[PDB]
Design a protein around this ligand. Sequence first.
Ligand code: HEC
Ligand code: HEC
Lengths: 126, 126
Amino acid sequence: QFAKPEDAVKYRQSAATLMASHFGRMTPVVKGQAPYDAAQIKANVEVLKTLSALPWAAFGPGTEGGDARPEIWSDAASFKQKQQAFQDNIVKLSAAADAGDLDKLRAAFGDVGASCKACHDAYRKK
Amino acid sequence: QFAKPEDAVKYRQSAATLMASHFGRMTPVVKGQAPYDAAQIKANVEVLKTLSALPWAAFGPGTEGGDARPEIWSDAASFKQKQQAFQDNIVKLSAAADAGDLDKLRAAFGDVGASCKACHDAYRKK
Ligand code: HEC
Ligand code: HEC
C-alpha cells in the first residue's frame, strides 16, 4: 500500500506511536495509581490488539529505512518469530482484560512490555 | 493519556496517518485498477473502523497545537457533529464491505472521502 519506502516507514512509526500510547496509558492502572475499570481496560486492549497487528506488514520488501535494522529483512524468519510472539503476548493481555482479571492483567502487561523491549533491542537502531 | 499537549498532537497525527493509509489504499480497488477481494476489503475496513474512532479523543482539553484550528474547541458541538457524521459514513462503508457489495463500497467510499475533506476544510490549518 506504500508508494515509496518512506511511506512504509511513516506508517510503521505511526502505528508504533499509537501502540505506545495504548499500552503505556495502562501503566498507572497496572500500578494501582489509577482505578481499574474492567470495561474501560477491555475496550482499550481491543484497540491495542488491532494496532499491534499493524506494523509488521509495513516492513515489506524494499521498505528499508528509519530506525529499522537491516537484519529485520536478512533474518526474516527470526523477525517474524518476534512479532508473532509479541502478538501471542497481546492475546494473553486480551484474555486477562476480557476476563476482568487485574492480577492477570498486570502479569500479561509485563510480558508484553518485555516483548516490545526484546524486539527493539535486536531490531531497532539506537 | 497525554503527559503534555504535544503528545496528543503526535497521537492524533499518527492516527490520521494510519487512517489515510487504510482509506487511500482502497482507491485502486474502488476504481477497478486493482482486483476486488471481498474478504480482503472487509478486513481492511474493520481496521479503518477501529482507527477512525481514535483521533477525536486526542483533541481533549488543553491539547491545542499542530494543524488543529482553535474552532475545534470553541465550537465543540459542531466539531463533534462532524466527527460523528464521519464515523456514521464509516459505518456505511463497513456495511458495504461486510456485504461484499462493490457498488455499495464505491458509493460509501466517496461519502467517507467527502467527510474527511469537509472536516479538514473547516478545522485543519492550511
Ligand atoms: C519487533 C517484533 C517489535 C516489537 C514487538 C515492537 N516494536 Fe516498536 N519498533 C520496532 C522497530 C523495528 C521500530 C523502528 C521502526 C522504524 O522504521 O523506525 C520500532 C519503533 C517503535 C517506536 C518509535 C516510533 C517512532 O516514533 O519513530 C515506538 C514508540 C515503539 N516502537 C513502541 C513499541 C511498543 C510500545 C511495543 C510493544 C507494545 C513495540 N514497539 C513492539 C520493532 C518492534
Ligand atoms: C474532523 C472531524 C476530521 C475528520 C472527519 C478527518 N480529519 Fe484528518 N485531520 C483533522 C484535523 C483537525 C487534523 C489536524 C491534526 C493536527 O493536530 O495537526 C487532521 C489531520 C489529518 C492528516 C495529517 C496528519 C499529519 O501528518 O500531521 C491526515 C493525513 C488526515 N487528517 C487524514 C484524514 C483522512 C484520510 C480522513 C477520512 C478517512 C480524515 N482525516 C478525517 C480532522 C479531521
